Amino acid sequence: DEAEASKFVEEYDRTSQVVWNEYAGANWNYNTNITTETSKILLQKNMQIAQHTLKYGTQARKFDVNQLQNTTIKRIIKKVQDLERAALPAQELEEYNKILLDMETTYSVATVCHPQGSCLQLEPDLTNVMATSRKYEDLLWAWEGWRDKAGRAILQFYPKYVELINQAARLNGYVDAGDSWRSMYETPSLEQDLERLFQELQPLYLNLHAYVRRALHRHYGAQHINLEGPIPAHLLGNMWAQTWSNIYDLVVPFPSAPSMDTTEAMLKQGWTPRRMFKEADDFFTSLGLLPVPPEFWQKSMLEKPTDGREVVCHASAWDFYNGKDFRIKQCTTVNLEDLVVAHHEMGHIQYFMQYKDLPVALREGANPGFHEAIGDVLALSVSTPKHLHSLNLLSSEGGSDEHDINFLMKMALDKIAFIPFSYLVDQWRWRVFDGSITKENYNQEWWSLRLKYQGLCPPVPRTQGDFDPGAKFHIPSSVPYIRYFVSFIIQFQFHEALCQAAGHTGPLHKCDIYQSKEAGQRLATAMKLGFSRPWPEAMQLITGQPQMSASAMLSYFKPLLDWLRTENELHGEKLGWPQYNWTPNS
Ligand SMILES: *[C@@H]1O[C@H](CO[C@@H]2O[C@@H](C)[C@@H](O)[C@@H](O)[C@@H]2O)[C@@H](O[C@@H]2O[C@H](CO)[C@@H](O[C@@H]3O[C@H](CO[C@H]4O[C@H](CO)[C@@H](O)[C@H](O)[C@@H]4O)[C@@H](O)[C@H](O)[C@@H]3O)[C@H](O)[C@H]2NC(C)=O)[C@H](O)[C@H]1NC(C)=O
Ligand SMILES: CC(=O)N[C@@H](CC(=O)O)C(=O)NC[C@H](CC1(C(=O)N[C@@H](Cc2ccc(O)cc2)C(=O)O)CCCC1)C(=O)O
Ligand SMILES: *[C@@H]1O[C@H](CO)[C@@H](O)[C@H](O)[C@H]1NC(C)=O
Ligand SMILES: [Cl-]
Ligand SMILES: [Cl-]
Ligand SMILES: [Zn+2]
């Protein structure tokens, strides 16, 4: 019994490496070269890996895990019993795989065109418009156009996707796909824990929201901003209003304390995408963590190709499951935002390398939020004015409370603004999956949540046939999103603990853990566990305690919360959006 199970897990691990490596290659080739051929080979490799999954998943289900002594072998076998889509009948599996590829392709090639004029892709063109335009009408053209071309085109696929992904989840013992996704956290109290964390961050978000709304009222006019209502969703510098830092110029608390133009500085100094990832590599190795192998530099696609290839430009990090081939694919733009993204992606690579000696079944983060947090932790240190100054991308900003509040505001526009967004994406999808939201009400329930959690409203009334969730990458690509909410909270807990381990004193937001070997050792021991143990053990290794907690993030931003409360009180802001029914008149 126990001996049969141990031999089984060894066989699974040997054959999975080979098959998973092959699948990763075909997926990479399509992702970096979208063609009918590569897409045909990908769909073919899909059926190959499903045959492997079905073979070993069927065997695994014949072990009564109850009678197993070893708990690492229990854990592997329990996971292999979940076939995911390979539980579907052959006909439905083929249809499911084609739906997913159609949704992804539709999103990745959509464009927004002027009549008799040029056509813009999402990256970099429309992203640039949303980030830099300060004209209501031009922002509206891009915001609405993307949803008209991308979102509306996904709607035809989504109901059938939902049916098929739920059917697979039921065939694997879950009640629906959202149940399956939540189970990745192995945390029965997950929904209540996440709701508690969201509530703890509400005071900070409402004060930020009210301050930004006042600043938008100053620039865009009283006729277009209701100081007691939701904010129009196209004015926040980002296609999804998920991060707001690109409108820093409109909301700067102390314009008398200016910051160097970081994009001009990178360009003037000859930064390139390759330099951006090299600086990330240096930060990781400064902590005593691992460098990326030479192969990484040869096989990664670090900028939009120019040879006519259509590619999936959305950034991603790749494990090829042979312990040696790791890659990034990013249509990198030379700016500070993409430097942070490069650190994020390099954090996924670091995790891949740290757990590469585990059985492939356990080669995942302690939970998906952990995988997302590693690179962001380092990026918190990289983002400090003192570190950016040492890269020659800022002037000296120390010894100045004005510069200090400006910096906290810059960070808040990204980190705090993102909290409600990241919460609501899977609040919506979980209710789509459990049947609470039907295709009749997809879009209406999306905007009810955009209002309830982010206090945003659409600048143009939505009409039948709109499917604005489809205009957000992770929806047609079927990537769960709550990982990013968890990540944004726990990355501050990790930062706090690593700064304490590095001997930092004083305000948490001034800490920079560059070159701390004690910090790197905490992260390395946690990452090496992969998915071999419940995630509270990895939490304990990093922070000395087992819980998720908003306290670290609230401590980081405490000086800004104090300042915002004073400023909002002085101006008589009404926090929140009691006039929640308001929408733009024109
Ligand atoms: C429950 O079972 C697990 C798993 O046991 C292993 O996997 C099963 C399928 C069988 O093949 C067993 O024969 C295997 O041992 C046990 O976990 C292992 O415990 C041992 C200690 O007894 C650990 O051994 C350590 O390994 C270190 C490095 O090994 C890794 O690195 C090499 C080379 O890089 C890599 O190729 C290899 O695959 C390893 O992953 C070594 O430095 C150290 O000194 C020590 O020898 C081993 O790492 C554990 N594996 C895992 C996956 O956790 C449990 O001990 C067992 N529990 C009980 C109560 O018996
Ligand atoms: C399974 C695998 O093999 N590869 C996976 C990694 C893994 O799970 O192992 C992978 O590469 N996924 C791609 C995805 C890309 C990005 C993303 O989509 N981010 C979210 C949310 C966000 C926003 C701001 C921010 O600062 C941090 C996160 C968004 O932009 O909406 C783009 C920019 C950042 C990360 C990613 O890396 O998470
Ligand atoms: C792109 O894909 C085609 C097949 O669709 C292939 O012949 C070609 O070599 C690929 N190009 C690159 C750069 O991979
Ligand atoms: Cl939207
Ligand atoms: Cl997740
Ligand atoms: Zn990520």
Ligand 3 atom with the smallest distance to the CA of 35 is 5
Pairing of strands 456-457, 231-232: parallel
Among the bound ligands, the one closest to the CA of 413: 2
In whole angstroms, what is the distance from residue 412 CA to residue 437 CA?
A: 32
Q: Give CA angle at 540 (524, 321), nearest 5°.
A: 40
* HSE-up of residue 322 (Cα within 13 Å, Cβ side): 14
Residues 6 or more apart whose CB falls under 8 angstroms from that of 412 comprise: 204, 208, 557, 560
Give catalytic residues, as residue numbers: 345, 474
- First vs last C-alpha separation in the chain: 71
How remote is the CA of residue 360 from the centroid of ligand 1, in Å? 13
> Which tokens in the block code for residue 548?
């998720």
As annotated, the binding site includes 147, 185, 344, 348, 372, 446, 450, 483
Look up residue 317 and give its DSSP letter. E
As annotated, the binding site for chloride includes 147, 185, 446, 450, 483
Around Cβ 441, how many Cβ atoms within 10 Å? 13
In whole angstroms, what is the distance from residue 387 CA to residue 375 CA?
A: 16
CB of 484 closer than 6 A to ligand 2?
yes
Residues 6 or more apart whose CB falls under 8 angstroms from that of 462 comprise: 443, 444, 447, 468
H or E stretch including 526?
A: helix 517-528
**88 phi/psi in degrees, rounded to 5:** -75, 150
CA distances from 405 to 140, 384, 493 (A): 31, 12, 21
In whole angstroms, what is the distance from residue 16 CA to residue 76 CA?
A: 13
SS3 581: coil
Residues 6 or more apart whose CB falls under 8 angstroms from that of 168 comprise: 83, 84, 85, 87, 88, 96, 177
Report CA Rg, the chain. 24
CA distances from 151 to 155, 164, 310, 442, 457 (A): 7, 20, 20, 12, 17
Name the method of structure determination.
X-ray
Residue 452, domain extent? 1-586
- The neighbourhood of ligand 6, an ion, using CB within 5 A, equals 372
> Which of 33, 39, 43 should be mutated for ligand 3, with most atoms under 8 A from CB?
33
Please report the sign of the dihedral spanned by the C-alpha atoms of residue 514, residue 517, residue 518, residue 523: positive
* HSE-up of residue 111 (Cα within 13 Å, Cβ side): 10
Structure's resolution in angstroms: 1.9
> Which tokens in the block code for residue 378?
């380092």
CB of 37 closer than 6 A to ligand 1?
no
* Structural domain total, the chain: 1
CB of 310 closer than 6 A to ligand 3?
no
Around Cβ 431, how many Cβ atoms within 10 Å? 16
> Which of 7, 9, 16, 72 should be mutated for ligand 1, with most atoms under 8 A from CB?
72
How remote is the CA of residue 359 from the centroid of ligand 2, in Å? 24
CB of 38 closer than 6 A to ligand 3?
yes
H or E stretch including 565?
A: helix 551-570
Burial letters 475-506, b for 16+ CB under 10 A, else e:
bbebebbbbbbbbbbbbbbbbbbbbbbbebee
